[PDB]
Amino acid sequence: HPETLVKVKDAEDQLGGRVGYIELDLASGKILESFRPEERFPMMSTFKVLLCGAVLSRVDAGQEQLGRRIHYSQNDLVKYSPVTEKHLTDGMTVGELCSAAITMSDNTAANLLLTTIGGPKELTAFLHNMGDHVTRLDRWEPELNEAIPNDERDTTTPVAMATTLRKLLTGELLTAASRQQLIDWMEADKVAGPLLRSALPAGWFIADKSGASERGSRGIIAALGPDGKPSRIVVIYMTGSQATMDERNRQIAEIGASLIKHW
Numbered sequence: 558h559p560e561t562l563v564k565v566k567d568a569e570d571q572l573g574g575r576v577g578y579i580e581l582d583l584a585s586g587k588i589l590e591s592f593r594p595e596e597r598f599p600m601m602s603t604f605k606v607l608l609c610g611a612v613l614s615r616v617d618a619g620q621e622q623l624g625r626r627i628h629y630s631q632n633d634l635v636k637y638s639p640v641t642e643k644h645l646t647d648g649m650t651v652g653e654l655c656s657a658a659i660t661m662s663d664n665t666a667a668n669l670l671l672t673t674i675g676g677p678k679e680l681t682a683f684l685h686n687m688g689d690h691v692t693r694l695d696r697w698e699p700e701l702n703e704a705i706p707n708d709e710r711d712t713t714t715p716v717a718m719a720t721t722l723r724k725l726l727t728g729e730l731l732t733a734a735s736r737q738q739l740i741d742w743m744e745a746d747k748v749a750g751p752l753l754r755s756a757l758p759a760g761w762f763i764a765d766k767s768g769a770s771e772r773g774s775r776g777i778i779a780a781l782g783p784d785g786k787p788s789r790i791v792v793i794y795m796t797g798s799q800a801t802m803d804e805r806n807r808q809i810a811e812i813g814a815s816l817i818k819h820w
């Protein structure tokens with residue numbers, strides 16, 4: 558049961574590639590622990606939380622409504638669309654699309670939402686406008702999942718993502734209702750069980766979003782804490798490894814267990 562930093566390094570030793578890690582105090586924003594904090598990693602589906610943050614900003618400004626219904630066709634479906642593929646007749650509201658993109662990592666949902674705001678480049682422009690010049694989205698789904706060995710497109714760094722996530726969840730950037738909706742969507746995450754959630758004790762709160770792409774990218778962003786209240790932000794990224802999805806999941810769970818047991 559090695560310290561958190563020791564486990565992250567151990568993970569990198571076992572997996573190959575690089576493992577990036579950061580841990581923020583929620584209340585203050587102070588970095589409590591880090592490793593490769595400022596090195597770039599593929600974002601993968603974790604950008605989907607950022608996307609919905611931009612959507613909710615439009616809502617706060619009366620430029621969008623969570624209830625606005627969006628219809629799409631069979632042509633619009635891309636691979637992995639467990640939710641959108643079920644609503645070709647009735648379509649889905651902007652809010653349902655965010656739920657699908659965040660809680661199931663629905664690709665088409667994310668593409669539809671990107672259209673509503675003006676595309677990948679317009680998310681990046683939203684991020685620049687809030688203080689994040691590091692993170693960048695350049696492509697749609699599923700092209701952004703190729704994690705070209707050290708390519709800067711569709712990347713972030715552990716420190717930028719964690720900082721951006723923290724502003725989204727706790728800053729005056731979104732209204733209280735909107736920022737509660739965002740964390741609510743993350744809390745309802747359904748496809749990250751084998752990650753940090755598998756190491757979570759009873760009564761703990763967590764809201765998270767996972768990602769996975771090409772060779773052998775894997776990541777998770779999270780707000781978590783004991784007593785049903787989030788008190789820290791954790792961001793883990795991985796890339797470069799040849800290991801299976803199982804091993805990469807397992808290593809993240811063991812980093813999680815270390816984080817918990819040394820809380």
Ligand SMILES: [Ca+2]
Nearest residue numbers: 566569570575
């Ligand atoms: Ca190393």
